[PDB]
Structures are given as structure tokens and as C-alpha cells.
Amino acid sequence: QLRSRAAFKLEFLLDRYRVVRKGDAVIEIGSSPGGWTQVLNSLARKIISIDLQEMEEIAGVRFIRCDIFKETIFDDIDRALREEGIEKVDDVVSDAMAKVSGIPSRDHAVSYQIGQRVMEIAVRYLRNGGNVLLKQFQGDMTNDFIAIWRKNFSSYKISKPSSEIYIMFFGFKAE
Ligand SMILES: C[S@@+](CC[C@H](N)C(=O)[O-])C[C@H]1O[C@@H](n2cnc3c(N)ncnc32)[C@H](O)[C@@H]1O
Numbered sequence: 001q002l003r004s005r006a007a008f009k010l011e012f013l014l015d016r017y018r019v020v021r022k023g024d025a026v027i028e029i030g031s032s033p034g035g036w037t038q039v040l041n042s043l044a045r046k047i048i049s050i051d052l053q054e055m056e057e058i059a060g061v062r063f064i065r066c067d068i069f070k071e072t073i074f075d076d077i078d079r080a081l082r083e084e085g086i087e088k089v090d091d092v093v094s095d096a097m098a099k100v101s102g103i104p105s106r107d108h109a110v111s112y113q114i115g116q117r118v119m120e121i122a123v124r125y126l127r128n129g130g131n132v133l134l135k136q137f138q139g140d141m142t143n144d145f146i147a148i149w150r151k152n153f154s155s156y157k158i159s160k161p162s163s164e165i166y167i168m169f170f171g172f173k174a175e
Pocket of ligand 1: 007032033037050052067098
């Protein structure tokens with residue numbers, strides 16, 4: 001999966017923004033089939049990968065089949081972190097998306113709801129100084145989403161590697 005379109009998108013983002021750093025522990029949301037995971041596995045010390053769908057095992061990657069919107073997500077991540085001896089992760093990254101309709105407003109709406117839940121997970125588990133990378137389909141809610149969530153971070157960036165964008169938040173502050 002090292003050669004997938006999704007993998008190339010992540011390589012581009014790491015080159016430009018260093019959003020994940022060598023030795024980081026990462027919660028990866030929307031991991032299947034594993035392009036980002038394989039790119040991250042070259043750099044991260046530990047990845048906890050989450051998806052609705054099965055994907056092939058990768059040595060040392062902790063995979064959790066889970067719907068992030070449902071009731072077990074926090075217990076599942078808590079257990080995985082406990083077993084890894086990690087209190088707070090360095091990054092939360094998400095390429096999660098549901099089925100695409102081809103309609104910018106609809107795809108934005110679905111993507112926004114995913115983004116909200118990704119951020120709820122991020123603020124729960126990120127270390128001070130940690131980063132977020134998340135895919136979003138741009139729309140009405142995007143500027144307000146950024147304005148709200150960037151209050152918990154030192155800075156943010158938006159990138160486009162045709163309404164799909166990647167939002168990055170840098171340097172988490174629990175304060
Ligand atoms: C664009 S694919 C991700 C590709 C991946 N980054 C790669 O490089 O192989 C999006 C993934 O998001 C997952 N996803 C969508 N909604 C989800 C949810 N509520 N909980 C967990 N995963 C979800 C889907 O099952 C799907 O596998």
C-alpha cells in the first residue's frame with residue numbers, strides 16, 4: 001500500500017509540514033487498507049489504527065476495528081494506550097471518510113461530523129505539544145471548525161495535495 005494515492009498524499013504532507021515526527025506515537029483514524037499506516041510505520045514508534053473495515057496486519061501496529069461514533073471508542077483507545085505504556089499520544093491523524101456522493105455540500109456535511117469526533121478524540125488523548133492531521137471536504141462549516149479548534153493549538157495549516165483538504169493543528173495546549 002506504500003504506493004497508493006493516499007500514501008503519496010501523506011508523504012507530501014510529511015515533507016511539507018512534518019506533522020508526524022520520527023519516534024511519535026500516533027492514533028490513526030480511518031486506516032484501511034493501510035497506505036498511511038505503512039508510511040507512518042516507517043517513522044512512528046507506535047501506531048494505534050482504527051477503522052470500520054478489516055485491513056491486513058502490519059507488524060507492531062495495534063489495529064482496532066471500531067466505529068468512532070459508537071460507544072466503545074474511548075474504552076478501546078484507553079485499553080490500547082494502557083497496554084503500550086502510553087499516557088498521551090504525540091499525534092492524532094485521520095483520513096476517515098464515509099461513502100462519497102460527489103456533491104460538495106453532502107460530502108462536507110459527512111466529513112464535518114467525522115472531523116468533530118476526531119477532534120473530541122484528539123483533545124482527550126493528545127500530549128501538550130501534540131499535532132492533529134485530518135482530512136475534510138471543504139464547505140460552510142470549515143472556517144468555523146478551524147476558528148473553534150485552533151484555540152487549543154499554537155498554530156494551524158490547511159493544504160491541498162476537488163473540495164478535499166487537509167487541516168493540521170500544531171502544538172496542543174490543554175490550557
Ligand atoms: C479514504 S479510506 C482511508 C485510506 C487510508 N488512509 C489508506 O491510506 O489506506 C477512509 C476510511 O475511513 C473509514 N471510516 C469512515 N467512517 C468511519 C468511522 N465512523 N469509524 C471508523 N472508520 C471510519 C472507512 O471505513 C475507510 O476505510
